[PDB]
Amino acid sequence: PIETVPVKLKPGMDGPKVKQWPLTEEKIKALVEICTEMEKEGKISKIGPENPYNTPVFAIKKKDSTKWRKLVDFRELNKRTQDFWEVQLGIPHPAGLKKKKSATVLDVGDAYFSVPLDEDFRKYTAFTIPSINNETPGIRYQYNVLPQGWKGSPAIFQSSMTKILEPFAAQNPDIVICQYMDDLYVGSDLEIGQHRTKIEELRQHLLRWGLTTPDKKHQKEPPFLWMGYELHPDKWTVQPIVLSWTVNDIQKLVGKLNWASQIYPGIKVRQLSKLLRGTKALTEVIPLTEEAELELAENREILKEPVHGVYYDPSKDLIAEIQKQGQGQWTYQIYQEPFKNLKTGKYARMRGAHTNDVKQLTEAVQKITTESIVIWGKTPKFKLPIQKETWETWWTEYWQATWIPEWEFVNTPPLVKLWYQLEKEPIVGAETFYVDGAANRETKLGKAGYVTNKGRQKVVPLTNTTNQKTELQAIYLALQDSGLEVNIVTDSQYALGIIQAQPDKSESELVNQIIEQLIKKEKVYLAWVPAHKGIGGNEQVDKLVSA
Amino acid sequence: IETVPVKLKPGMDGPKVKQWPLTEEKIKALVEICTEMEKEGKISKIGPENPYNTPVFAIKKSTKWRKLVDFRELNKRTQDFWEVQLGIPHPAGLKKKKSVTVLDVGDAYFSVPLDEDFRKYTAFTIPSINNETPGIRYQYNVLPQGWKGSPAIFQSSMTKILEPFKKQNPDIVIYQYMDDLYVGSDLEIGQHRTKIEELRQHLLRWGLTTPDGYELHPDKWTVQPIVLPEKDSWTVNDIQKLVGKLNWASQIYPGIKVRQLSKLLRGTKALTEVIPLTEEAELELAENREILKEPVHGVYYDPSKDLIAEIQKQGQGQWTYQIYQEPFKNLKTGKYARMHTNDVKQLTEAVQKITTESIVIWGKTPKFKLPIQKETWETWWTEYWQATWIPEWEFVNTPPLVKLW
Ligand SMILES: N#Cc1cc2c(Oc3ccccc3OCCn3ccc(=O)[nH]c3=O)cccn2c1
Numbered sequence: 016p017i018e019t020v021p022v023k024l025k026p027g028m029d030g031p032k033v034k035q036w037p038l039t040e041e042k043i044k045a046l047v048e049i050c051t052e053m054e055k056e057g058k059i060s061k062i063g064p065e066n067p068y069n070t071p072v073f074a075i076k077k078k079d080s081t082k083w084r085k086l087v088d089f090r091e092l093n094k095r096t097q098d099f100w101e102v103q104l105g106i107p108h109p110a111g112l113k114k115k116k117s118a119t120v121l122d123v124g125d126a127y128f129s130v131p132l133d134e135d136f137r138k139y140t141a142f143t144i145p146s147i148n149n150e151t152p153g154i155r156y157q158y159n160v161l162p163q164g165w166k167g168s169p170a171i172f173q174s175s176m177t178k179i180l181e182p183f184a185a186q187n188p189d190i191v192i193c194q195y196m197d198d199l200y201v202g203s204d205l206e207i208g209q210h211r212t213k214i215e216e217l218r219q220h221l222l223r224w225g226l227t228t229p230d231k232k233h234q235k236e237p238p239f240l241w242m243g244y245e246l247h248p249d250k251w252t253v254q255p256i257v258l259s260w261t262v263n264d265i266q267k268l269v270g271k272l273n274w275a276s277q278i279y280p281g282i283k284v285r286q287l288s289k290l291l292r293g294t295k296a297l298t299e300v301i302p303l304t305e306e307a308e309l310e311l312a313e314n315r316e317i318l319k320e321p322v323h324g325v326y327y328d329p330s331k332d333l334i335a336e337i338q339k340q341g342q343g344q345w346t347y348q349i350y351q352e353p354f355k356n357l358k359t360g361k362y363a364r365m366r367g368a369h370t371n372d373v374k375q376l377t378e379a380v381q382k383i384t385t386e387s388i389v390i391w392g393k394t395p396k397f398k399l400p401i402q403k404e405t406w407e408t409w410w411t412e413y414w415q416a417t418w419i420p421e422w423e424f425v426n427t428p429p430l431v432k433l434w435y436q437l438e439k440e441p442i443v444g445a446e447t448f449y450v451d452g453a454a455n456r457e458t459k460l461g462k463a464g465y466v467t468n469k470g471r472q473k474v475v476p477l478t479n480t481t482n483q484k485t486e487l488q489a490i491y492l493a494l495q496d497s498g499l500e501v502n503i504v505t506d507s508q509y510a511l512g513i514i515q516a517q518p519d520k521s522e523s524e525l526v527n528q529i530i531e532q533l534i535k536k537e538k539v540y541l542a543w544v545p546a547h548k549g550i551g552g553n554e555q556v557d558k559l560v561s562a
Numbered sequence: 563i564e565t566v567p568v569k570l571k572p573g574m575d576g577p578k579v580k581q582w583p584l585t586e587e588k589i590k591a592l593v594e595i596c597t598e599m600e601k602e603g604k605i606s607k608i609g610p611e612n613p614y615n616t617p618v619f620a621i622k623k624s625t626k627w628r629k630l631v632d633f634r635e636l637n638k639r640t641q642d643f644w645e646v647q648l649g650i651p652h653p654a655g656l657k658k659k660k661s662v663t664v665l666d667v668g669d670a671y672f673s674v675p676l677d678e679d680f681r682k683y684t685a686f687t688i689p690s691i692n693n694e695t696p697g698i699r700y701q702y703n704v705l706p707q708g709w710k711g712s713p714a715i716f717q718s719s720m721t722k723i724l725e726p727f728k729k730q731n732p733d734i735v736i737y738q739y740m741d742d743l744y745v746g747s748d749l750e751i752g753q754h755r756t757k758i759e760e761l762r763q764h765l766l767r768w769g770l771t772t773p774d775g776y777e778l779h780p781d782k783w784t785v786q787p788i789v790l791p792e793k794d795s796w797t798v799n800d801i802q803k804l805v806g807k808l809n810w811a812s813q814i815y816p817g818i819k820v821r822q823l824s825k826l827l828r829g830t831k832a833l834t835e836v837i838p839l840t841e842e843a844e845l846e847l848a849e850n851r852e853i854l855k856e857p858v859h860g861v862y863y864d865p866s867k868d869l870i871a872e873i874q875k876q877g878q879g880q881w882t883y884q885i886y887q888e889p890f891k892n893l894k895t896g897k898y899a900r901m902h903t904n905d906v907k908q909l910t911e912a913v914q915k916i917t918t919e920s921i922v923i924w925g926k927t928p929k930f931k932l933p934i935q936k937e938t939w940e941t942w943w944t945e946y947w948q949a950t951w952i953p954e955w956e957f958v959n960t961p962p963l964v965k966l967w
């Protein structure tokens with residue numbers, strides 16, 4: 016026998032009560048045949064009228080195609096059934112598998128029907144078979160085993176399988192057993208004779224618990240078509256990916272591209288993803304963009320070359336190497352031997368504006384690090400296109416705590432660098448610009464300008480600008496009209512922040528103009544002063560622009 | 563043998579928190595520890611009808627590994643109800659003592675059994691690498707070590723065990739925060755250390771094991787006062803910053819004047835230009851210096867409210883922090899020096915030091931505002947953590963412009 020998991024319904028809910036819909040008498044007889052057979056094997060049992068609960072029963076009428084099946088909708092029973100410990104959504108990644116001498120797949124047949132259901136819960140699974148004539152009362156059964164649509168069957172099957180496997184795993188620890196839904200993947204490094212011996216021991220051990228294994232026909236074909244992958248005994252890859260597209264045709268294309276990026280390096284989806292903005296109607300078409308169409312042409316070229324990944328060797332280091340490909344886009348490879356990759360991937364910028372290539376690189380290292388721990392259980396060593404001097408300068412002066420594991424520079428351009436550095440101290444003999452901006456919230460127009468120690472002044476009128484755009488534009492004017500060495504004084508806490516963060520690029524066009532002016536300057540010092548305190552030229556520029 | 567019945571706060575379900583991924587060394591450690599705990603009856607295997615889960619990690623304070631459960635969510639749902647029913651008083655004398663040593667009393671809880679209707683809420687999962695196997699699932703049969711309910715239930719027996727020692731040493735102050743014993747004396751350090759070993763022997767004789775962060779000196783602790791620079795010549799820039807810092811201090815200290823000093827900067831001057839200080843502004847500067855010299859007053863700890871901690875990274879391994887319940891009313895401020903070593907390691911040491919001080923001073927832990935990207939902190943904070951507790955934290959991605967300590 017197999018121990019039952021005590022199951023309960025939600026606190027304020029009761030067993031389902033749904034009347035079965037009328038069904039064609041051809042199907043009804045087929046349902047009678049299936050349920051009488053299941054009654055024979057102990058899986059279901061006929062219920063008396065004392066049971067009030069009912070759940071809808073459907074069917075597919077028997078045919079040569081796999082249309083001879085009993086279906087039951089437990090959606091209302093599922094809504095009334097307790098929550099369980101969710102079976103893991105993460106799927107084992109092939110690049111984390113360790114090559115074994117042999118590896119057999121054993122799928123369990125009638126897996127849910129081999130595990131008993133809690134007797135106290137059985138009543139709620141009650142189903143009534145339809146009556147051929149409306150005058151006939153229907154015949155009713157309830158499940159004694161785990162129903163195929165029920166909310167609890169996957170998790171109760173998994174836990175039952177774990178308990179059955181525990182002694183055999185203890186008895187034979189050299190053998191590695193992986194569990195996936197209804198399947199057991201068993202690998203070992205024993206000699207081929209002993210490996211097929213222990214499989215039969217395992218195959219026989221599950222039968223004593225009522226679990227049937229594909230002993231005669233093991234699907235032993237070393238290339239396994241599993242969850243979109245090809246698992247060869249020497250390697251793994253992705254299953255072949257098929258290369259005018261409507262909006263939904265784009266989405267499935269991007270999905271197939273991302274799925275390809277596990278092992279095919281240099282797959283790009285950024286242009287298509289920008290196309291898939293809003294436009295929630297799948298029927299509506301997307302306009303073809305030459306740059307996006309180019310993105311597909313490059314991907315088709317990559318997909319032409321067959322790529323394979325290697326399995327994992329616990330005795331060697333994991334290396335992760337990152338390339339900045341394009342703006343905001345990053346690509347990385349993970350390998351142990353110099354040209355054989357374990358797998359591949361990409362990383363793209365976060366949604367926020369005003370980012371730095373160094374910030375993005377550090378985040379990408381962060382992403383890869385978590386991925387490695389999930390797949391392999393350790394962190395990799397890194398190869399990064401950033402000088403140690405660039406990183407050390409960045410970390411020492413960066414307001415946040417940052418870290419990267421051990422890493423070695425790799426002289427592969429594009430190299431990650433800091434496009435400019437602000438001066439810590441004021442510059443002697445450099446003109447001092449006191450800037451300010453202001454704007455009307457009711458009328459989107461505004462003004463911006465500066466006043467300097469040498470008596471220079473400027474005001475420019477602005478349209479459709481917020482107060483923050485003006486404060487940022489006022490700094491822009493001062494950079495444009497300044498020499499190579501300039502001191503700028505602003506009261507804008509907002510503008511100080513954007514520039515202090517030393518962003519490499521931005522979404523806002525004004526900030527990009529500021530960065531490009533900063534790159535052209537030899538020395539820039541930015542200083543902050545409290546607004547409205549009668550300080551310096553801050554009060555003078557305040558009147559010059561808000562008047 | 564009797565188990566104190568434990569209830570959750572009404573309208574609250576048990577914790578459902580995801581297990582963060584672990585390294586293979588950490589997983590292997592956890593299976594060793596949990597196998598032996600399972601043999602000892604402390605924990606037992608659970609089925610899928612148990613939907614709750616609480617994170618678990620492995621730290622190493624001790625070459626041997628030690629398990630750490632993150633009961634923060636269970637505490638937010640149990641302890642607050644459990645703190646009113648069975649509270650622990652906090653002595654204001656602990657902060658006064660010359661030396662405080664911190665002992666791990668976590669093994670004490672493993673003798674007292676937990677109410678069976680509560681055990682399911684203590685579920686935790688040992689994760690798997692690459693999802694090759696399902697997570698190993700356990701729940702507690704005895705009082706859990708990180709649970710804020712555990713010291714509350716054991717408090718009665720704790721007072722009995724310590725009574726002989728407290729009779730023999732009425733001067734020593736003993737405070738229990740979850741899993742730890744804070745033992746403060748004003749003796750000589752060598753005498754203090756000797757009394758600690760006597761206390762350890764006492765607990766051992768009564769069946770409480772202690773392992774074989776500590777040696778704190780609360781009376782040496784002092785606040786970080788606001789200090790204005792003292793220069794012989796001031797650039798315009800120097801005065802602007804002084805006015806900005808003095809403008810900043812106006813929120814914490816009433817009475818700060820920036821009138822005369824702001825008058826020095828009148829007009830559109832160059833930053834490098836030295837400014838001779840007027841006699842009136844020299845008076846305004848010195849007036850603000852004396853105001854900043856005398857400690858702040860009028861901030862009272864409110865046990866109903868939450869303590870919050872902010873931390874700023876300065877250079878050279880220096881870190882500053884402020885503890886407050888209200889935005890501009892700081893109960894404490896400090897600065898740490900870190901003997902560069904990892905920023906993350908420096909930050910996790912700072913968080914542990916601040917929490918320890920906040921336990922001694924108030925018997926409460928602060929909620930930290932950590933200046934670090936969440937994912938970086940979540941991956942590596944465990945690598946340096948040495949404490950039996952875990953504070954509450956959020957993340958700030960916005961740099962504080964002031965950096966005025
Ligand atoms: N259908 C299918 C299928 C097989 C597997 C699987 O097989 C292994 C089982 C235990 C140990 C190592 C294994 O594989 C190691 C790598 N490997 C995989 C296949 C092969 O032929 N040889 C080989 O070394 C693991 C995970 C998912 N799976 C899906």
Ligand SMILES: [Mg+2]
Pocket residue numbers: 451452453506546557
């Ligand atoms: Mg203004």
